[model samples]
Target: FRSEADKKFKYSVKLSDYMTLQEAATAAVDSLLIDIDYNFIDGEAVDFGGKVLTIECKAKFIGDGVLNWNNLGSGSKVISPHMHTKTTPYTVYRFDDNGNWVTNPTTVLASVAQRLDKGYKPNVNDHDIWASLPDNVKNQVAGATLRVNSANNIIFTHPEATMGGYLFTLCNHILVESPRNFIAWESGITFENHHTTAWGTGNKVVGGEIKYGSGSAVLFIRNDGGDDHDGGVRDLISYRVGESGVKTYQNEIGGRSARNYRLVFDNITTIQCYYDGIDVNADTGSPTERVDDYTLAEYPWFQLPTQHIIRNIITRDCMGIGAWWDGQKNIIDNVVTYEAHKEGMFDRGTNNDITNITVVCANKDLTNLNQIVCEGGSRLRGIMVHAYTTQGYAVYAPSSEVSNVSCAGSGTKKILCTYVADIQGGNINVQHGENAMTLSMRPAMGGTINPSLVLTADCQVASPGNEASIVKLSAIQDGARVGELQLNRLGFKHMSIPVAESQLPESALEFNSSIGFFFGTDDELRILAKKPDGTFVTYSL
Candidate 1:
């Protein structure tokens, strides 16, 4: 529903050219209200010769009235009886003067409901009735059948009649179980602390602001068992979600059981969420699961929501992870998470594409956290991670392609990869680490395939601990170890190998590199070389 400011109705009428411009304008406004009565604001006659007066009036109906002046544009004169003033056009929904739902017969909701009650399954052939709807409603539905699927009190009110809060904004809309086919383009109305679940295809909300409760979720898109999977929220500003809600699905925008679709969250800013700021994972249980009563299954169809996109998002003070994605073939770009309680970005999906993702958890001294964890096979470009706690990992990407990465932490490992085959980057920076960057190409995930590493970067590793190692390449525990290692343009300072000599590689033929250097046990520069006789030799230079 539109506000009073948006309900200004104006139209242009062709009047006689004999009278004065002001007189013609006033006369047009006089005869315009023969069928209905409204308060006339003013009128303007721009063309004296043609005498076309554009009269602006206010339509104030107390309870019920339908304006049958549907003359949009006839001949050369343009008549817009329902002239909306706002720039971003939207389907107007508002109450009457006495604060009740306006069941105007011309309203698209009431009109559609009336047809459906008369046992009419509207289809493409019934284009006459559908086309008769207002232009804004027809544009949103896009020729789709409009149905009223109601279970109970779908839309209610909030904020004690004040038009600014979650209670006010949501009471204006329907919130029944999985309401579908809604397109909300609102402005100036605010919302606070609540969860709204939606489903079906083509559901979108554009250009709105929402204030959230300390422990509430903003919108949960739990399209369970849905395949057509297409919906998004663009240019939305939310204050908080999941920061203090008892809702099990507490993220600002969290979904499960949606596959083969494109769910986009673009240009959104969130402040403080309890679970994750934005998450898309595969959950087999119901959408309204509690914290304890849930199950995580491994069904083939329920694997993950594939091919989603999340770009230009910023999250601050997230109690849990900032971006939680457990899907495949997704694209995430230009995201920043600040002071996350858990991991900043937890990616447990395969073949995902990421760019310009930064995670910072430096405010509090939370322990044992990983800023960015890309556990599955993916490609990460322009990634930056930072954490300020003990036993924390700045970047923990195993079996992934990582490049242009900058990681800093006062924890165990600044950059750690156990099963990575190659990490090619333009500039890889590591700082304040126990182990600067340990790249052990060992297939520890139960595979007989031999692993290798090809590192190409202007790599700089600086550690402030004597027990820190510049770069440790080990094959000791030995399932399938680093059979080939290629290190290019490496730089290190104040770091040494903190491992025993038994952890070194046994076969010199394993390392196929042009230049290789690592610290010995006693902080000596031990250069690696493969003799022509296929023997391994470590020389201190």
Candidate 2:
């Protein structure tokens, strides 16, 4: 048997792009493993096209292991601006296309070697270094300190400054307190995670560790690598309140859950992740499985992980949805996904408000995905499943209400949704659907249309509570008279319309047999009138 030919393989039967490669499982660092650390190291680089730039990194041994990258010039490219590294041993081996190297860089670039020692000194300042962090972090310096090297980049004297406990507070104290500064901080959806971290992780792989500060903190980063999102550095930008203290703050904020904390991405151009863009489930484990379309009834975040406050976020080519949240009352203001491998925002929280979304599948390279989901119960305000290339339900929350929804579908691939009437309480408003307006044409892509209208939902009970959630369309024009519509459940349990005083019966609208109304332009004022045989028509001015 020809074992040689049998063993040989191709990654793709159609493309074979990965026909040849090397796979490493594990490594035994019997002696040592020093990653190219760039924590305290800071420098600037020309972006080739960027107008401005700056970056910081430190050698893995910049502390008692007194280290320095002597050559800080163009030829001395010591650190990677991408912010992360791989988890494998440094080969320094540049292999040929055939998975083999003639000579390792060890001998070839022998003069360009990085050596190590066991010594250090310092002239770091709380000011020069404080720009990287709030001066307040310096005030709390007990086991850590900031060092200044007036000649080049500034660094921390204590490479171990981020030992633990709300480490991010030390650096991003300003945002941590009132972290709602989203628009000013934006990142291009188009970027990469240069795997240059010492621990062998990607750039998008960082997350703030278990931090406790008023835990209801809002966390976000315009740009960062996991080396900083993880390792000891993750503590530098992540935060929390009282750890073991749950219900106390969870209940102190919103409803049963105050929804005080949030991880907002209000104006992000695009967020890409080799792994889950944001995996809050790391500590919370996985949320309980779907109990029903109504409620996963799972508060898996026994620790109350910060929720989300998303806006126009682009879900790029990643594994799955741009974001993964398990918190409650999150707001998905807007989102756009294109040629994505997963859903947009896979949310499994409660009382969420998902509104204003735009989906484009012009590439037709999409897959099994959901734009927004609340297997844990949610509500829709103003959403558009605007399918340009389409497939899959735009919003999959069986136990939810939709104030207004508009979706499109094609014969090739359409969006067919679900809702279980009063049984599931999805009382919705159907403003736009391809097949709406006729009982016979009762939408093939079934969804709960405006159940509050006289002729909307085919199945609904006659009641005001479920009929109208909140009627406050105080702006817009009526056909004959420009006016506003308002219904106040607080006191006035009736329709309140303030008109231009030209479209009612004798100026005072009536009811029962006294019913009368007006309709028409100044040329033809159409008013109500009874006929001889009791049939009725409209009389106008």
Candidate 3:
């Protein structure tokens, strides 16, 4: 029975196993309460669906008189007020008292208890209710859901917490088929024993156009467990070569039985292994002997083929080296070497372009270091490509194009021009040698052929013109020495009159004095002079 509304009343109803007492009482009370004209039953109940009971009720009365069903007398004005009224229908279930189920309402009581214990919660299906929630509250719920899905902790203990070192670990035997497309491994991390051979193994096959971006990438190797006892020997990292022509290795550290090796590169294009730093030794039976040292010729390397792109590289203690051999164009901005017995940097390949390359030898006393050799139409320029060799020249361009080449220091005498067809360009300075310049060519256009050209000491020459022309020099001030003088050509004539220095005019010095002379023929020898009035006075010579 459900009480829908409240009204002043003091009454009680008992429900029995035979019949529902509330239903019987409501019917009996409403029978007499209906017609004293201003009176009505306050509550009502109904039975429906054979067994279910539902009740809707309210109570009301006119006077503050006590209500008692047993005290009903025939002359109490014969009026029975409506004590209560219930409108909505209810169901009453009748069960046998002797049955196994008895008359106990256990299922009904359990349902009520369950509802009281746990409050209502909206599920994902409750979109309308969820949308009505505040933004912060919604975020909290969403975060909770995400954590549940991930099955992890939702809140971080510290906001600034980060992984200490390299977060990802890659195997050394792991070969990258497309290194150009590979993302850079993050900074502040170490890649362990990344065997270069492992780069593209099996179906991945490592030979492709591998491009590296503007950061550093490193390969580390585990050192082999052996003792050579040399300071340089302990620093070696070895790479294993496979049948596919791919070679790589891990570095081994000394003292510790497990060796660690590391190779670091920073914005570098080409890498060369010096003999002293890394070497390949020969092993026989149980003992291994230190064979020839390692060098660039023994390893496979790559450089960018783009022209005029400067690369910063360091090579030391290597033999017979060259920048780019595979017909690649490159610009080596700076290079340094020390204690190298052979040529520092050598390029003898065909059609390989080099520009603005500078090679500096740290050990001045060390000899036999040559600059570069541009062979078969190769080109070089803006380079201090020099060497101190007793035999051949610092640079040897037998049949190549060389331009803007400069050389300094001693022992550069044999740096001669071997080919007349070789093209050379601006300001070739061979500063400190006996025969500074050499021009070897047969005069095709005119004049005597002297390919071995020399410009010694402080001698200066103006831009090329006819040898018969008179060169002139001038001073800017009024009383200054006439730095303006002219060298006439072979057939030119000039005025022979002597002019006083004090007679020189201010106008001549105002716009900077001009000294002039003629060339080509004797008839063209006109006397041109700057007068005190700043005007040119020309007369037949």
Candidate 4:
């Protein structure tokens, strides 16, 4: 008996049924050559109680327990049947290595087994539950831990393990309401299809303020089926876990888009979506249909701080305009659509960038195949969309602005670079029609772009200015590129040319600081330069 364990262990003594008090006392005396010291079991009926069998604050499980557990020992060591009071909830919990919570006695065994496999204690508290436990389980009752659950397994390591997976089979829904608890579900390996979930520690109300998690408290998802690209039978799914903050990587998740929690997808290969990737309203039916009921219209799906980034994703052939984010702004970058069945990258989140996007599809006759379509107030840049059929459209933007775009193989409609205020550089090009320079807000490109696409320098806005401003080409040696003229200040900004090294002057060309009147002709430029009043003037060609 080990007491002062903050307390002590106590019990009683008794005799065998056949041997009375006298027969039992002298039965082991042998009364020959054996000398007795004290006779520790000197009592009547044994009663093992009044005691300290549990403790915590931090004594980790050693895969080690008591030598004899339960009320089965001889004389006074026998345990009473009513001493165990399980089926009660535990108020305290253990934290795993990742700072995630490991609740219940079964998971305590699982975590203990996992960490002990590396030859050390998992810092987990251990004790056997009053069930049909195995010999090892029955032998390791070290503490008074208890909790009632629908199911429990004797042994568990992680999700893919045999008995580990058994703990979660055929369960309709599971709730993990512990603090800092995370579950890694690998299809066919970690879990089966759980139809519903009213879980997670997020906002109390549906659309309340979001609280970013502080530890490893995210539900991770993936699949491990048999197919080359798409494996795992019974696709990884979630029922109604609206703001669970679960994420998937290289996985397939198909479920009702409404309760689908906020998640991140990095380098995702394929998403078998039933609705708009994030916007539930656009996903009334197939991508072709939109619902009348504005269900949860004000609540933007998967909304995150900064934003929940979903990049490099490839979804199945669906009509849902790639993805739709109605009000909240987010960044979607470097999206490659090789087999998309409809238009790509449409967003209504104003003041966002939809850039560096490419679409290569084998041509289907769908209505809105605009390369980049945004609701309003977004900038589309460096876009390249192509349809092999030489039909459809390169872009369709009635409410957004675009820049630095290149679209080929689009049907007969000519692309007009007409948003004049959005252009800063020169020479904007449009395929299958003409390479126009600054039609409007087109991405202004400059400097001898393509031999076929020449910049006529359609130099618009040519006007006259003060006497110091005249168009003239000259040579100069520079220190900080300190040439005699900063032509840009003279409003010749559109005339900058990307010069080659061979075009440099042989040496520095100088001008005397004296007054003089130079000559001029159509063959050469003339200069009437003077410093009479420290004012310099020049002539044009």
Q: Tell me, by TM-score, which candidate is best.
A: 1
1-541: candidate 1 lDDT, tens digit per residue: 9777646855433333323323434446312321232222222112222232233322211111111211111112211121111122222222244533333436524434211001122223223354566545444321111111211122211111001111121121222211111111111122221224333333333444443222333333332213433345557655443232111122223333222245566776766543466666544243333222122343232235456777898877765677767667778899898877678887866778989998877323365667788777778888877666655567777677777777664543355654333555698555432323343343443443444442322224343352322233434335443433333314334333333343245543364542346667677766676666656667777
Candidate 1 segments exceeding 4 Å error: 1-199, 214-230, 242-261, 284-302, 362-365, 409-412, 418-541
What tens-digit string does per-residue lDDT give for candidate 2 at 207-308?
222222212112222212231332111212222121110111122111122222333344433322222333332123344332211123434543233344
lDDT of 3 by residue, 417-534 (tens): 3333344579765532232223232333133333222212322333347223333333333433333333332334552332333334334334424544443243355445666556
Task: Provide the overall lDDT of each model, using Cα atoms, as 2-decimal numbers.
Answer: 0.43, 0.32, 0.28, 0.31
- Quote the lDDT for 272 in model 3: 23
Candidate 4 yields a Cα-based lDDT of 0.31
Model 4 CA deviation exceeding 4 Å by range: 1-262, 271-306, 315-327, 348-351, 366-368, 390-392, 409-541
Specify the poorest-scoring 10-residue window by lDDT in model 3.
Answer: 142-151
lDDT assessment of candidate 2: 0.32
Q: Model 3, clash count?
A: 50
Off by over 4 Å in 3: 1-310, 316-333, 336-339, 361-369, 413-541
* TM-score of every candidate: 0.43, 0.34, 0.28, 0.32
TM-score of 2: 0.34
Clashes of 2: 36
- Native-structure RMSD, model 4: 21.9
